[PDB]
Design a binder for this molecule. Structure first.
Ligand code: ANP
Ligand code: ANP
Ligand code: HFG
Ligand code: HFG
Ligand code: MG
Ligand code: MG
Lengths: 563, 563
């Protein structure tokens, strides 16, 4: 393609609101444009990268017999009522009415739709297993869209769904997908790690998330150096082995603590280490108010609380709800309320806690005497340095972007939506399901996060929108224009060449080229009359003069040796 | 792919409601499944056909420098307010609210979105022309979804938009698109004709529709045998040259006409030919009621009326609106109402018309004496046999499916949405726009309409979901299964082979194969031990025995000679 005919609105200045490097670079390089919060257009270069990603995805899906389909975005509410998700979900599910008042969801994911396709069609065990996938734009009215394509409201997902006669068959396809996902991410230029993910509040099914390792990552991976242990910090269990720090029991005492809000401020005020303070938070669990206690150097993990209580309906009590129930909160109160404490609170006595009265705290508070703990448990995040759940060694942290997930779904949808098959013994059984997804537009951004420098994007060979950037320094000069025209015709059969044929200053062409980030650059300039050009590598910045008779061999060898 | 792993829910019986052959066959062959009215899932084989169509589309777009992008479905109402389409359109535009009460349209087409992309980015004449396109699902809440993929509510469109400094540049790209569209349709196996289309009520810009010639087609193409004249029957002008059939003027007379509703019933009742009766219809044009007169053998053309009056707000008066104004209607009434008559009414005198009184009609009604005609004009459809507007010869009719359109849009959106560029002389000018579209999912159905027989689909080589159907008659037999396994491995590198490896009766495999419609079939049966198979052509039904040492050459030669 001649660059004069390709829309590439490169920017001089990136706005302050853009925080993530991938977001900043996709804007600056003229690859995406925001329509509104969380909603983007993919401009020509991004679209080519998306096409390269989806071609790799299609190869890897076909390799494991995952068969492509395309399902609708517009989905009748009645389908979502069958599963119960219509009623279970709130504003994140986008909803609308047609001209006859009939209600619809815009698909955030397709468990019901795909179940509706296969039910009473996958009728026998002889037809199983079956795996279907699509590459299709999903809709989620995210509370906080952010970081460009990393969290949109309209976004591209590759979602797959598999159907099975038994658990062993599901296990096989889950492994196939796991392996296919590893291949997909490596091929597109992402360094990713599969990590054990949380199975949800109620379920205990096997699930792994694929995490693109990057500093912008909002997930923390807990990993071992001694074993293959890798878990989301939300899931990673903390094993408690007693190590008491108890002193002589003292009488309870309310103390004045003016302008003291936080646990660390209280620690500083009393001249004590923060770990000896116990923090108290009020949660609302299935309508009932509870208290959760953790030490001052720890933080409450809501995902563990949800899994512990076995419900997703857990949230912090609001300002008004706290006042109606009881400044800094504490466990000593004359009221029927269940108090839960993290296991590591047992290492202390003479607790420092809130007084349920602004400007005050309690010291020398003791369990049994002053208040009772109903149950102890693992209600916190692991810290870096602590011993892992498998006993292999010490916990280390790495930050990650969730680029995909694999999930053993089971019979949830097939039971609720009556999707059955006749087994070996002729009896009706619900289809056993797996579901799997890659965030395609998120993955595009993750590629940029891991493949860029201070001057722009550095696209991997596998996904670069064009292979070669052919640039004329001054096309007013006949020798330069004509040589570049000839080289375009020569190289645009074997390679995809972006030919910067524009009547633009050399400096802007090179700045644009740095942003755009194609792996190899052929510069036609002052030595065109001699049949000499310059070849420049985007990754290293290495430049060399090359004569046109050698150029095909030099470019091909350089291209083949790219990662 | 092994057919045991591909979801293909072939049907024994097609429901009565499915009318169009393409709709019936896409259902019967297991290629689509309805989710609800006008909303479909594309099953594995249809998805492969769609991928083949879009690959051809992409090649032909790149050939004319039409550059791929991907724009969002979710579009803020504020954008649609800029153009005025938010207010101009009614229930066909699907609308919704997000969680903050902000209003959105689901894109039925993307003129505003694309204008928002390029405005203040295509800043100079030096950047023009620019052509962008996407392949993306559109949403239209159609009043009457029908014929499967021919009229959906969620459907795939390839929409392109071009931007220009002057009218000559627009003319060039319009011609490029016209030519590209001709190529696309021929390549995918559609016999199509470009025809002059109506430019709308207000505008007079150049537009052509591409019509897939087929009997299910709801459009009628008027064409010449002597010239290149081709027009939609909505547009095709009728030139009136007087041929009076006048008799001696008679006195007006009201006559009893019991149980006479229609013009032909009245003709039969009075013993007169139907052409001597004048029909009267009441229309509402920009709030004002009018009368339109046409002869009994003619019909009113609303598209001509809209173009004549220069407004889209024309509709028939309702039952209640007719009563408030005045059985069979007629022009003789004591009221201030404008009466328009088709030109061919002038060939008659002593008109037979309604009496504005149930059970009665008027005879011997004459213009000037009994009523006045305000204006005469071309308000009807041309009939087959009549002389064409260009004077080349006689009108012939062919039925067609509108598979695409090309349109010289001009500055409508660039004016309303302030999308300007600096011209040669440094002054701001609105971007001159073209817009173009192909219905991709409609085109898939049109391919089936033109490429099928009584036993199933007959896919063209260019778009067939697989190239070869490899079928084992009885895979319990080791020689058959093993030979078929070997041939699959041999042929699935050069070709895409669907291998019917299923443990199913031969009869169902062949019935499924006929429906599925791949061009060549390799049958492994009783002579597998001898290294002999049967090759069968789907189009002709010709079968021949072939030895496996000759099979690659025989298949390749047959495949190369397919249309
Ligand atoms: N709002 C979004 N924008 C872009 N990509 C997304 C978004 N939500 C999910 N994805 C991607 O789609 C994949 C599958 O969806 P899903 O498993 O439902 O995500 P999720 O659990 O909601 N992730 P998150 O919201 O980031 O915690 C994810 O692994 C992401 O890569
Ligand atoms: N409801 C639909 N279902 C499937 N395809 C459609 C639909 N509407 C339009 N298309 C296709 O998209 C192309 C461009 O859209 P457009 O020019 O807006 O169609 P249109 O004038 O509304 N046609 P029609 O509604 O059939 O009279 C058409 O030429 C069709 O091939
Ligand atoms: O979407 C999932 C589970 C899996 N679905 C198939 C693709 C891969 C993915 O991990 C989790 N999820 C995430 N977000 C959601 C948001 C809404 Br709104 C709804 Cl209704 C449902 C969901 C929802 O089910
Ligand atoms: O969509 C068009 C004009 C052209 N747009 C770009 C692709 C090719 C197509 O011919 C005509 N059209 C047809 N149907 C529509 C339905 C609705 Br609802 C709206 Cl808002 C707008 C429209 C509308 O503009
Ligand atoms: Mg989410
Ligand atoms: Mg329409």
């Amino acid at each position: 393609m001649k660059q004069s005919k390709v829309f590439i609105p490169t920017m001089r200045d990136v706005p302050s609101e853009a925080e993530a490097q991938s977001h900043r670079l996709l804007l600056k390089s003229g690859l995406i444009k925001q329509s509104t919060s969380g909603i983007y257009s993919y401009l020509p270069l991004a679209t080519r990268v998306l096409n390269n990603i989806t071609a790799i995805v299609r190869q890897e899906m076909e390799r494991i017999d995952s068969v492509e389909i395309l399902m609708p975005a517009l989905q009748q509410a009645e389908l979502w009522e069958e599963s119960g998700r219509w009623g279970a979900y709130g504003p994140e599910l986008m909803r609308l009415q047609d001209r006859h008042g009939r209600q619809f969801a815009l698909g955030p994911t397709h468990e019901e739709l795909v179940t509706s396709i296969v039910r009473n069609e996958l009728k026998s065990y002889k037809q199983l297993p079956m795996t279907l996938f699509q590459i299709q734009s999903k809709f989620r009215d995210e509370k906080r869209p952010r970081f460009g394509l990393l969290r949109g409201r309209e976004f591209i997902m590759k979602d797959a769904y598999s159907f099975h006669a038994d658990e062993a068959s599901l296990d096989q396809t889950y492994q196939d997908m796991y392996q296919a996902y590893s291949r997909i991410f490596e091929r597109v230029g992402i360094n990713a790690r599969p990590v054990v993910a949380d199975s949800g509040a109620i379920g205990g099914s096997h699930t792994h998330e694929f995490m693109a390792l990057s500093a912008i990552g909002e997930d923390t991976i807990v990993y071992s150096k001694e074993s293959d242990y890798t878990a989301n910090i939300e899931k990673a269990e903390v094993v408690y082995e007693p190590n008491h720090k108890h002193s002589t029991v003292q009488p309870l005492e309310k103390i004045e603590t003016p302008n003291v809000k936080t646990a660390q401020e209280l620690a500083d005020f009393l001249g004590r280490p923060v770990d000896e303070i116990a923090k108290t938070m009020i949660f609302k669990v299935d309508g009932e108010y509870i208290m959760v206690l953790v030490r001052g150097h720890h933080e409450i993990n809501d995902i563990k609380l949800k899994s512990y209580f076995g419900t997703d309906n857990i949230e912090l009590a609001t300002q008004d709800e706290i006042v109606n129930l009881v400044g800094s909160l504490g466990p000593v109160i004359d009221k029927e309320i269940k108090i839960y404490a993290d296991n590591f609170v047992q290492d202390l006595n003479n607790l420092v806690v809130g007084a349920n009265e602004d400007g005050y705290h309690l010291i020398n508070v003791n369990v049994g005497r002053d208040f009772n703990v109903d149950e102890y448990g693992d209600f916190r995040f692991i810290l870096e340095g602590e011993k892992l759940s498998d006993g292999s060694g010490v916990a280390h942290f790495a930050e990650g972007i969730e680029v995909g997930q694999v999930f053993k779904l089971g019979t949830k949808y097939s039971e609720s939506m009556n999707a059955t098959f006749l087994d070996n013994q002729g009896k009706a059984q619900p289809l056993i399901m797996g579901c799997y997804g890659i965030g395609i537009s998120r993955t595009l951004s993750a590629i940029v996060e891991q493949n860029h420098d201070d001057n722009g994007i550095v696209w991997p060979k596998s996904v670069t929108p064009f292979d070669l950037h052919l640039i004329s320094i001054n096309p007013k000069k006949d020798d330069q224009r004509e040589l570049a025209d000839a080289l375009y015709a020569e190289f645009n059969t074997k390679f995809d060449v972006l030919y910067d044929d524009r009547q633009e200053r050399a400096g802007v062409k090179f700045n644009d080229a740095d942003l755009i980030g194609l792996p190899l650059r052929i510069v036609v300039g002052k030595r065109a009359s001699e049949g000499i050009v310059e070849v420049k590598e985007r990754l290293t910045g290495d430049s060399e003069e090359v004569h046109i008779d050698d150029l095909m061999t030099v470019i091909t060898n350089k291209y083949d040796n790219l990662k």
